[PDB]
Write an enzyme that holds these catalytic residues in place. Structure first.
Site, PDB file in Angstrom:
ATOM      1  N   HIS B  94       8.085 -54.761  27.785  1.00  0.00           N
ATOM      2  CA  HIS B  94       8.002 -55.807  28.614  1.00  0.00           C
ATOM      3  C   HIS B  94       6.801 -55.987  29.124  1.00  0.00           C
ATOM      4  O   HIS B  94       6.069 -54.956  29.690  1.00  0.00           O
ATOM      5  CB  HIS B  94       9.092 -56.151  29.445  1.00  0.00           C
ATOM      6  N   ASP B  96       6.120 -57.768  33.135  1.00  0.00           N
ATOM      7  CA  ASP B  96       6.935 -57.931  34.383  1.00  0.00           C
ATOM      8  C   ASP B  96       7.030 -59.496  34.712  1.00  0.00           C
ATOM      9  O   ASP B  96       6.014 -60.103  34.796  1.00  0.00           O
ATOM     10  CB  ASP B  96       6.211 -57.185  35.362  1.00  0.00           C
ATOM     11  N   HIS B 226       4.617 -52.763  29.207  1.00  0.00           N
ATOM     12  CA  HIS B 226       5.031 -51.480  29.323  1.00  0.00           C
ATOM     13  C   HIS B 226       6.326 -50.921  29.147  1.00  0.00           C
ATOM     14  O   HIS B 226       7.176 -51.862  28.959  1.00  0.00           O
ATOM     15  CB  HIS B 226       4.567 -50.707  30.604  1.00  0.00           C
ATOM     16  N   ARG B 241       6.747 -49.218  43.445  1.00  0.00           N
ATOM     17  CA  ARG B 241       6.169 -50.347  42.815  1.00  0.00           C
ATOM     18  C   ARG B 241       5.711 -51.444  44.163  1.00  0.00           C
ATOM     19  O   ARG B 241       6.417 -51.755  44.980  1.00  0.00           O
ATOM     20  CB  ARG B 241       6.609 -51.024  41.990  1.00  0.00           C
TER      21      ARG B 241
END
Ligand code: FE
Ligand code: FE
Ligand code: FE
Ligand code: FE
Lengths: 239, 271, 285, 248
Positions: B94, B96, B226, B241
């Site tokens: 996917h 993000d 990723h 993150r």
């Protein structure tokens, strides 16, 4: 008097009022030709008088005379035949239907991105006396001007694509061509004669008669070389 | 402060060396980091033992505008998102947060707690995948639009090909938030999605990173997808993150993404 | 009253002649009709100009227990279902009401108002499709289970709200043993959401694989409707498809459905209801 | 002292503590062999001393030496599929050139019951298009571990008795499960590295991500046996003769 009766929205018509043969007026011939182009496959019935010579004489007025699987006839050559005439001779007691699909309607029904894809795709067709030709996936019909798909079971691959991609796209387009809505399925009776535009159809001979004996006689009419949407012609690789 | 860039593979990935990462870097250093990011798509810093959440965030501030952690997953207005193995493993390709108009431009991911084995992450270049398309498939991609959703319901129609606002390069925009392609039957959406995804995730277009303590990855979310590999059994794994605000995708003809549902103003501004 | 059966194709379809269809037929006649239905899967009566809704229903009563028209589409407890082109066109391969445990065993469909062209219906034999499977695919089908569920104009939204008013979900075997013939038959069609235990991508690929074999033209018959026509099909051994090739022409047929039983798989295991209650729709036959 | 360090849940381990060569003890050899069978591909590092002769001498202790940007098992178009390979780094590109391995054992265990049974009952035609053609079971019983493992990869032309469209769909279904990232390990080569893999329980993929920089690795391959399916049936050779390639 040539009356045309539609059988379905996108393909198929019955023709009535014509004793089919080699002695028809130009008006009658061109009305038959007009119906063929509009309806893609047309059916005459009650042609009990018709024999091989008569069928051939009749074919000669429409052009120049020359599989449980969806196909367009002889697409592995450059000069794809424009049409065929098929007459019932001996029929099984059950089954033995034939189906036709409109490759014109299927194109019109494509959403814009898939149209443009089809417009830009080329396919390798072969008979495996070896024949190999690259045809556009979309050809411009020389008599109607309509864009039509050109695929069917002689397609080995799409030019420039991985085999997995050729398989997926072939299935995608074929799915749209053979959607029941774009098809007519004919039950043969003695005295029946079918004529189809091989430039705007595929067909399928249904093997649902358990190998009872079945004979129909075909006359095929010469066609021309497909041209794509940009004026490019088919490229013969072999044969 | 020399920023040295070492390529990891032909189409994607580079290591960065020579930088003590933090909020006190020179514009020359920041823009060299930014240049590497755009060229290599995902870049990796190592030995960042000094780095904590505040430092990661201070550093992120130099590269863009930090986002709220996530549109729906954030507990409040905090800018750090836990990538915690107890809550999820994103074992799926996917990009993000593509279910909003303002797709975040980049993410920074820092190792905190690692399993003794496994726990790799992979990235794919959606730029290289586009370049590699034969012409008929390029044009198809150029003309396709996709419905992305998160099922706070979000639904947005994005072009399958967007023009990267900093590089000018055309890049694919797909991944697992795609529900369908506009105007197509579902069987056709499935087949084309698989076709394009196959090309994106071809091993040649990917880099796969083995995390070590002190590692920090930054990726261009406009030119990648990723995948978090769940190959560490039940071991605990935590990375932190920070996500940077992006802009609204524009297609190859200048048309912008069309929001169908949801409002991302609260998640982030438009960069 | 002689009941003559004329085959239409190798694997499916027969015309019935010699019967004025109604509620006053002898047991010999009824059981000869029933025998034809089981052998040929869909059978067609013609020239039934006398037949009305009450007659169709009286006739249906002799072949089984009429259901409520539909689990969700019925206004109340009425046994007739309108197949009306204004509300819906089922342009998709399916077996009727497979989202309940008690899949109806059969349906009777009578022509009322027909378009001048198109409007054909096709049926496929899920029995023949199974027999034609190579051994590895048979064993696969034998061991697969599927989740079936029921999930422009105002007429069209009504239809869809009504259809889904209650939620139904049931796990059926992909292969069921036919309770009257003993023959193994496939059970798939468009109410299938997935195959139990498989990734969605695998469910899609296997579904297409089996459906491809079911809907191969060789396993199908396609009927051109005429006034006075009545079709009866074994919903345990078929799927069907209403072809939308008549543009915006008005088309109406009337359906009566007969109660069926709960599918049993090849090892004796029965269907598992996850959600919904079909007691009100019909009993178990 | 042979220490084994797992790289991932289903496949891959580093080996440490061994100067690799032809002069290792049976205990050391069999510990290496045990690791190979458990972990499917194993990696030695720092083997700077190792040359072609040494690699071969080392190979001799593990079996009988014999004498691709695409997922495959080596030489499956013969009956006697080689059991293992040893691959040593010689010359590496400055970037890229990774190799990936997938566990065909783990992929089988992960199959839901209906797909296991399918795999158990499927046979595949493998070819090299010296024309070779052999029918192998899709599931073989590993002769040393007893574990059931998938046997597919890019030499598969079709599945016996099935339409081509069905072969393509099932091949993709099984391959999808084999090459799922979770069942793979991807190795970054460094000078001194040596990989050994069990070719009976893996596939691998040589990644072409180094733009045609020069790259050399040296391979030694070890003779294997003829696959047996879950019911005791052996592979059926249709064409070719592998006697010259290797013994059984
Ligand atoms: Fe033909
Ligand atoms: Fe993510
Ligand atoms: Fe129906
Ligand atoms: Fe190899």
């Amino acid at each position: 008097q040539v009356t045309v009766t539609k059988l379905g929205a996108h393909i198929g018509a019955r023709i009535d009022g014509v004793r089919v043969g080699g002695d028809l007026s130009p008006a009658t011939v061109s009305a038959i030709n007009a119906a063929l182009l509009e309806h893609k496959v047309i059916f005459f019935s009650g042609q009990d008088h018709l024999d091989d010579a008569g069928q051939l004489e009749f074919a000669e007025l429409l052009g120049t005379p020359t599989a449980n699987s969806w196909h367009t006839d002889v697409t592995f050559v450059d000069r794809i035949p424009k049409a065929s005439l098929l007459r019932a001779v001996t029929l099984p007691s059950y089954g033995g239907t034939t189906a036709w699909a409109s490759t014109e309607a299927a194109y019109q029904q494509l959403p814009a991105p898939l149209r443009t894809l089809a417009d830009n795709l080329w396919a390798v067709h072969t008979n495996r006396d070896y024949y190999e030709v690259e045809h556009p996936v979309v050809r411009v019909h020389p008599e109607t001007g309509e864009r039509v798909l050109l695929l069917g079971h002689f397609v080995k691959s799409f030019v420039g694509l991985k085999d997995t991609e050729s398989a997926a796209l072939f299935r995608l387009f074929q799915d749209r061509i053979t959607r029941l809505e774009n098809t007519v399925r004919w039950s043969w009776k003695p005295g029946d004669l079918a004529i189809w535009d091989n430039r705007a159809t595929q067909h399928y001979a249904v093997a649902d008669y358990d190998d009872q004996y079945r004979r129909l006689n075909r006359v095929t009419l010469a066609g021309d070389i497909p041209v794509d949407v940009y004026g490019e012609r088919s490229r013969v690789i072999a044969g």
